[PDB]
Design an enzyme around this catalytic site. Structure first.
Site, short mmCIF file in Angstrom:
data_model
loop_
_atom_site.label_atom_id
_atom_site.label_comp_id
_atom_site.label_asym_id
_atom_site.label_seq_id
_atom_site.Cartn_x
_atom_site.Cartn_y
_atom_site.Cartn_z
CB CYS A 94 -1.21 0.01 0.92
CD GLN A 129 2.16 2.76 6.82
OE1 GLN A 129 1.63 1.65 6.80
NE2 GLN A 129 3.47 2.93 6.70
NE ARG A 146 -1.33 0.75 11.52
CZ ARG A 146 -1.24 0.14 10.34
NH1 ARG A 146 -1.66 0.74 9.23
NH2 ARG A 146 -0.72 -1.08 10.27
CG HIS A 199 -1.40 4.28 4.14
ND1 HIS A 199 -2.30 4.13 5.17
CD2 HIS A 199 -0.87 3.05 3.93
CE1 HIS A 199 -2.30 2.87 5.58
NE2 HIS A 199 -1.44 2.20 4.84
#
Length: 357
Positions: A122, A149, A256, A263
């Site tokens: 991703c 993220q 994260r 993202h």
């Protein structure tokens, strides 16, 4: 028409694939056969029913692929395996797809007889969709990454946990926020107290995400000190570009944050040569129709270069483009991109469209 099988079509990535395929009327170009892992429609574990198909498209996961793929290939099956899972990405008889970037690598592999086409990581996919023009003109020497993220990359339960955490933080100071005269430090102490409490749901993340961040994604790789996610920046960017022989160093930190499905990434790109800023903005913009150069202005960055704006869209905005204090060959760039689209379902939908045509 090609007989195409679909596994994991009810899961999160699979559902986005089904919505996108319905939106682009892709079912009118193939014969869809739907599978299920349920014993309560064909069985996803029936090697005989799967062998009758030309193409297999799966979003079920690595645990499925590692159980079914070797069994199906051992029976002599001549067909195509299109996967969204990471399980087979680094296999030699497998190509990582992202067609607006690597159409040549895909076209060559189709002709060479490669039968496995896997979707990329991703973060890497969203990076290449943004700054792909610099990679095309071999202008990239190295790229330092810092990621922001979203919870969707970890899973459905993880998005729910993030949302539940956000609610509990506000609820802890609900009456206090309604009063415009109340103490901000008192409010903070209560939110932090709730974040640290026993009943705060941190099960899926192992730490608080709402009102905080986690600077660790996936298993540790003892050899280089990188996490498996950070390693994919080096491994996958080069496999997508076909540069496994001459690797372009792509490394950094994967973090994260409290976003749902987009993202975002902060880059420090070292260019091979010194080129003007207005020329670099045209090399980025003309790579594909999805990338969007956001001018270095406040009101426009706030309106365009955010998860709030890009969520659920195919747009890949890139901005904050300027020369760094380290030299005119050091470029700063900030991008935002939807994880479930160009980072999961879209590269899969597009390789399939090519196979059934």
């Amino acid at each position: 028409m090609k007989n195409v099988g679909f596994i994991g079509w009810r899961g999160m990535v699979g559902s986005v694939l089904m919505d996108r395929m319905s939106q682009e009327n892709d079912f009118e170009n193939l014969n869809p056969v739907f599978f299920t892992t349920s014993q309560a429609l064909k069985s996803a574990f029936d090697i005989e029913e799967l062998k009758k198909l030309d193409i297999i498209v799966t979003c079920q996961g690595g645990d499925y692929t590692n159980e079914v793929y070797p069994k199906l290939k051992a029976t002599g099956w001549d067909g195509y395996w299109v996967d969204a899972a990471s399980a087979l990405r680094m296999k030699d008889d497998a190509i990582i797809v992202l067609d607006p970037v690597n159409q040549h690598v895909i076209s060559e592999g189709l002709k060479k007889g490669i039968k496995t086409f896997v979707g990329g990581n991703c973060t890497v996919s969203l990076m290449l969709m943004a700054i792909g023009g610099l990679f095309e003109k071999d202008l990239v020497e190295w790229i330092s990454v810092a990621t922001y993220q979203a919870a969707s990359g970890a899973g459905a339960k993880n998005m729910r946990e993030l949302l539940s955490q956000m609610g509990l933080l506000e609820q802890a100071v609900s009456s206090e926020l309604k009063d415009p005269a109340s103490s901000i430090l008192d409010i903070e102490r209560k939110v932090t107290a709730k974040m640290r409490a026993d009943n705060f749901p941190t099960d899926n993340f192992g730490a608080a995400l709402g009102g905080s961040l986690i600077p660790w994604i996936d298993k540790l790789l003892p050899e280089t000190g990188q996490t498996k996610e950070e390693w994919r920046g080096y491994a996958e960017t080069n496999k997508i570009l076909g540069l496994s022989d001459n690797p372009i160093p792509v490394d950094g930190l994967c973090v994260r944050i409290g976003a749902l499905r987009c993202h975002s990434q902060a880059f420090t790109i070292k260019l091979k040569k010194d080129l003007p800023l207005e020329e670099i903005e045209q090399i980025i913009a003309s790579h594909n129709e999805w990338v969007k150069v956001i001018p270095n202005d406040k009101e426009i960055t706030l309106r365009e270069l955010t998860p709030a704006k890009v969520t659920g869209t195919l747009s890949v905005p890139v901005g904050r483009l300027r020369k760094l204090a380290m030299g005119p060959e050091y470029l700063a760039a900030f991008t935002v991109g939807d994880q479930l689209l160009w980072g999961a379902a879209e590269p899969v939908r597009r390789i399939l469209k090519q196979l059934v045509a």
